[PDB]
Amino acid sequence: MADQLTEEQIAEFKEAFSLFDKDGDGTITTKELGTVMRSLGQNPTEAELQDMGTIDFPEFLTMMARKMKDTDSEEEIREAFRVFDKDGNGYISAAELRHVMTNLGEKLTDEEVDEMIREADIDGDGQVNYEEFVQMMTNAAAAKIQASFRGHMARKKIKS
Template sequence: MAKFFTPVQINEYKECFSLYDKKQKGKIVAKDLITVMRCLGTSPTFGEIERHLQIHKIEKTGELDFSTFLTMMHRQMQQEDPKAEILEALRMTDKQKKGYIQASELRAKLTMLGEKLTNKEVDELFKEANVKSNGTVNYEEFTQMVTLPPVDY
């Protein structure tokens, strides 16, 4: 499974995994799986967690080792597609199917729904994506811009 992750990712995952390895046995309890995965940037549902456990024949009250955890993380990351999720959410907002929405409407959604952003965070996001606060946002371009991998300094 290590071939799917960089050494940096593996170290980050191991560090987080170890925080929940309360008995220091190299295992976490199944009930902590969703928390660990979410801490590492994925968004599994309870149903997805149940499927991961079923695939590996682990009871809800059972434990899993780091190797099994890596397999589950890989599977979870493959099924999540943030670009598609963002595009779908923005398309649902575009009632006339024009391909764009008002920047003010996008700001309202980003600051009031889901994992709420602050106005300062939205300002930074808009600046990075070259969005004028009084204009329209082409959501295909916006999604492309905000899902680019971060610049490595």
């Protein structure tokens, strides 16, 4: 899993991490976690209360790598939503939303498009702020979107 990380990233993380190895050695306490990440360049907020009483170095390398992955695919889905934002005002009408989902990619079906709508912030004129939708879900493009929404729907119903 650290295999996903570059040798420079691994040194970067060794250093940062060891700087807060003010001992009990090989471990940092979870309180210093916020700080370590910032002494890099992350500014997390509560995605950081979710992140996991001390973290050892392999699991820090792990969280870090899992986070690169957590952000790349975030970008990938915002990318997809951009492809479909006619003018780029950061918005997509529910109608445009319904049209591409059902018409491109692994075509969803209208019953499974309605629930891709209810959850999202209210009908801002029929418009949809898709960023408040990427932050919720956490051609080929519709497929990246469609695949993710499914993953989001898998998560919600995994409760019951």
